[PDB]
RNA sequence: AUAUUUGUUACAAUACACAUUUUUUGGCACCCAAAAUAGGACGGGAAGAGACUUUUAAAGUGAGACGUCGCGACCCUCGCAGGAGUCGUUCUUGACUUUUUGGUCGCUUGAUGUUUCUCUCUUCCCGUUC
């Protein structure tokens, strides 16, 4: 019905937790009414910052159902 | 450029396996009909997880994927 | 008059004691100056309604006994009660405080009634009782109280608790 | 109705102090307010009662009573309480 | 419904959040929608295991919210007439 | 489901006559024939009490090895024994075989 | 064609079609023909039940249904059977339902 | 702005291969060529293989439900 | 204890202190004020009570005394998704 | 058709509402909402004992059961008795209705 | 001279609408194992010992990590006012603005819950049961 308001967030590098375990960081591109969030230059954060972190793809889309909290690391 | 619903309309009365999301159980059988929600009906199905099953109704929420 | 069920029913259970819990019951027309000469009978009429606090202050009660299983009850105010002995097995796990000021409890009678506990209450006031005057009464009360957090407004001194524990051993 | 206490042990904790106060004042009458809203401590506590008579009695009896080492200076409040 | 309207009435005030994942986000509420998904400003975070951090801005999905703690003085607010 | 008059053929004795002799199967029929009146709803409770049982496609009755049917017909008799019994107020111990047949026959 | 365009009666004809011709026709043909059905729930407990009634959400009324549930701890198994005369079953728990021969 | 399902349509026509993560309970991730999709984000994948979490077996042309979708990643 | 009206719906009861059960095994006790279509409700002065894992072991079948760790949170708004069942504790002021 | 409209006619009957937790509720039934929210009156709600060398029962259902305030201290097994429980609709799994009532009249 | 009843309107309110990621047609379920007899078990508290830890024989009881409110204080700190002010209005109401004691440190083991790994006996005191 109503679109979520991310309007200040887009183009800013953002960390968001996927499910209980996961945390993905990427530059937010677009979003929809289900909160499905597509972002680019995705990286999967882990305990060891440079080591266990591995990039996903040039463009990644996320189902809004697996989104828990969304924090922007940015202005 | 096939979408899901015409893909199920093309898979009617063909042998299709369906993997549920739980035990990695797949029902292998001839599809009969589907609902709007993609409820499934099957004939001569067989449960793989080894058995033979005459007729089957599968609710939409428990299926993982559908293949031919 | 005597503490009946009807009286209990009548009692004002509207104004909750906002310090802790809910439903600060005052049995009869008013528990303060109810004049319950016998022991607190018909406790089942309340039926563990609700640190549930019951004020029995300014009443004739001789013995702190006759309670029904009350899980909620945490506070007993029993001020101006002619308490003599308060031995019971009903209110044991339940209850966090007991105010016994201006009563008739004996120094030996109060000690005898509890029979000792591994853990009990947490707040206790025995002020204006004959027993408190009695020599080594504070040491005897600490030994009887077993575990205790207070003794007549002053906490049993950590060192006093240690010495009392040594006396118990 | 309200009774403004003064000259008490500041070393004791807030909630505990309130509890103690409640325990003290239950003999006179029904204590409406457990502890003073300001909670500055060091004596400053407003014991709100239901009846004025009870309050009066309290004032009479507990004037210079030993509570946590020091003698409590009981006195009637200037302004009426927010609850009353 | 009234429960969501009270959340809209709490904008610009410090609120607490319990996500169904077990965490706790306490901080100032900037935005809220009728889907109960809110965004909070200058918020202290408590992980499910107790580790506490601080983040400047957060957006949470309403489906994952469990309870929201709102300043008490909104109790007498006109919604409840 | 028939809106028209027509002659249709079926079989009242589906399994039990095929298993057990002809004298007894009618007797087991009549133990039932009294019973479904007395089993106003408990019929489908007691006939389908064993959910392993299926009705054959050609047949009507619930096909079984006929041991529980001896139990079902004994249960069903007892519902007839009490319902005949309650109207005339007979004790269950006072019920005798000459009375039990009179309940079955009458 | 989406459902919000249709009128009040077109939804009734749609539900009549879906019950008569569709997946749930397996249950419907099972209700009329008095054929016992096997139902697996999410719980993992399977009921052999005759279907008195059913519905869109798949919740259904069954009479004389028998429940079969096994449990194991450290590979020690036991099979337990429970008989209930009347059952109303909420449809979200079910996964597979088969029609016995 | 690039709406997410627009991006998925750019996965359909650009014929780029995608890896897709499922829910954490199932323990497999699918990868293949996304052909077409519905409003519910349930997608048909041509030449799909299921990898447990590289010896996974090839699937086929398979319809995968959107309820179990977590990530769609190139 | 307290007898609720034999026919009383969630609308009939307002300002009663309730006891709310969630899916996670914790309880919110307090005065109900509003509620909604999907049954997410507003409690006034609410305290969440929880059962300790050692306490949970004690609850297993054999007078029991459970130490229930609880924390006070005022004027909350629950979510209908989490709510499991509701019971009445007390009657209004 | 909404089959929940059937439950609306079962009012004032003894019933067991067997929930997703495994918790079972015996009680007298009152008005059932269109979302299948079921409100009962005099209810004894409990948890079954899986025997199986005393395998551990549901850990969440024991806590939720003690936290109703209706579990009495001296109960040996795990049960609680209380008046007026209101149950959300999505929590229900099975409903066992009495044997006496006839379906042919109520299922119309 | 002789408040009740009837009709209409509005509000609040109950019974008839929706299985597709944001609440009600389920991501569902699983760690595993422990009492049987004909003076005896079970719980709680205290003491001793074994095995654990620490120092170079002598010291207490499985170990390592978040918080939670508490026992001390060589510190700070004055001491009586959710409420307060303003304006409208008449003997206490509305509209518009200002914004919680505890601020901290030890704990010579507060006291106490999560989460990983590995493998108790003797003596006294108090309650319950046959």
From Swiss-Prot, chain A:
Pfam families: LSM (PF01423)
Top-level taxon: Eukaryota
Gene: SMX2
Key words, A-Z: Cytoplasm, mRNA processing, mRNA splicing, Nucleus, Ribonucleoprotein, RNA-binding, Spliceosome
Other remarks in the entry: Present with 1400 molecules/cell in log phase SD medium.
Protein location: Nucleus; Cytoplasm
Bilayer-crossing regions: none
Residue ranges of domain Sm in the record: 1-75
Name of this protein: Small nuclear ribonucleoprotein G
Family indicated by similarity: Belongs to the snRNP Sm proteins family.
Molecular function GO terms recorded: RNA binding
GO terms of biological process kind: 7-methylguanosine cap hypermethylation; mRNA 5'-splice site recognition; mRNA splicing, via spliceosome; spliceosomal complex assembly; spliceosomal snRNP assembly; U2-type prespliceosome assembly
Description of how the protein assembles with itself and partners: Component of the Sm core complex, present in spliceosomal snRNP U1, U2, U4/U6 and U5. The core complex contains SMB1, SMD1, SMD2, SMD3, SME1, SMX3 and SMX2 (Sm proteins B, D1, D2, D3, E, F and G, respectively), and is probably a heptameric ring structure. SMX2 specifically interacts with SME1.
Organism: Saccharomyces cerevisiae (strain ATCC 204508 / S288c) (Baker's yeast)
Curated annotation (Swiss-Prot), chain F:
Full protein name: Pre-mRNA-splicing factor 8
Gene that encodes the chain: PRP8
Top-level taxon of origin: Eukaryota
Record's miscellaneous remark: Present with 468 molecules/cell in log phase SD medium.
Domain notes: The MPN (JAB/Mov34) domain has structural similarity with deubiquitinating enzymes, but lacks the residues that would bind the catalytic metal ion.
Portion of the full sequence shown: 1980 to 2085 of 2413
Subcellular location: Nucleus
Known role: Functions as a scaffold that mediates the ordered assembly of spliceosomal proteins and snRNAs. Required for association of BRR2 with the spliceosomal U5 snRNP, and the subsequent assembly of the U4/U6-U5 tri-snRNP complex. Functions as a scaffold that positions spliceosomal U2, U5 and U6 snRNAs at splice sites on pre-mRNA substrates, so that splicing can occur. Interacts with both the 5' and the 3' splice site, as well as the branch region. Has a role in branch site-3' splice site selection. Associates with the branch site-3' splice 3'-exon region. Also has a role in cell cycle.
Transmembrane region(s): none
Quaternary structure (record): Component of the U4/U6-U5 tri-snRNP complex composed of the U4, U6 and U5 snRNAs and at least PRP3, PRP4, PRP6, PRP8, PRP18, PRP31, PRP38, SNU13, SNU23, SNU66, SNU114, SPP381, SMB1, SMD1, SMD2, SMD3, SMX2, SMX3, LSM2, LSM3, LSM4, LSM5, LSM6, LSM7, LSM8, BRR2 and DIB1.
From Swiss-Prot, chain G:
Any one GO BP annotation for this protein: spliceosomal snRNP assembly
Protein's cellular compartments: Nucleus; Cytoplasm, Cytosol
One Pfam family recorded for the sequence: LSM
SMART domains on file: Sm
Keywords assigned: Cytoplasm, mRNA processing, mRNA splicing, Nucleus, Ribonucleoprotein, RNA-binding
Organism per entry: Saccharomyces cerevisiae (strain ATCC 204508 / S288c) (Baker's yeast)
GO cellular component term, pick one: cytoplasm
Family classification: Belongs to the snRNP core protein family.
Positions of the Sm domain: 24-101
Record note on quaternary structure: Component of the Sm core complex, present in spliceosomal snRNP U1, U2, U4/U6 and U5. The core complex contains SMB1, SMD1, SMD2, SMD3, SME1, SMX3 and SMX2 (Sm proteins B, D1, D2, D3, E, F and G, respectively), and is probably a heptameric ring structure.
A molecular function GO annotation: RNA binding
Gene, per the UniProt record: SMD2
The protein, known as: Small nuclear ribonucleoprotein Sm D2
Gene3D superfamilies for the chain: 2.30.30.100
Predominant subcellular localization, coarse grouping: nucleus
Additional information: Present with 799 molecules/cell in log phase SD medium.
Superkingdom to which the source organism belongs: Eukaryota
UniProtKB/Swiss-Prot annotation, chain I:
Organism domain of life: Eukaryota
Residue ranges of domain Sm in the record: 5-92
Record localization: Nucleus; Cytoplasm
Self-association state and partner proteins as the record states: Component of the Sm core complex, present in spliceosomal snRNP U1, U2, U4/U6 and U5. The core complex contains SMB1, SMD1, SMD2, SMD3, SME1, SMX3 and SMX2 (Sm proteins B, D1, D2, D3, E, F and G, respectively), and is probably a heptameric ring structure. SMB1 specifically interacts with SMD3.
Domain notes: C-terminal extension may function as a nuclear localization signal (NLS).
Family note: Belongs to the snRNP SmB/SmN family.
Other facts: Present with 861 molecules/cell in log phase SD medium.
Function according to Swiss-Prot or TrEMBL: Plays a role in pre-mRNA splicing as a core component of the spliceosomal U1, U2, U4 and U5 small nuclear ribonucleoproteins (snRNPs), the building blocks of the spliceosome.
Protein name, per record: Small nuclear ribonucleoprotein-associated protein B
Species this chain originates from: Saccharomyces cerevisiae (strain ATCC 204508 / S288c) (Baker's yeast)
Lineage of source species: Eukaryota, Fungi, Dikarya, Ascomycota, Saccharomycotina
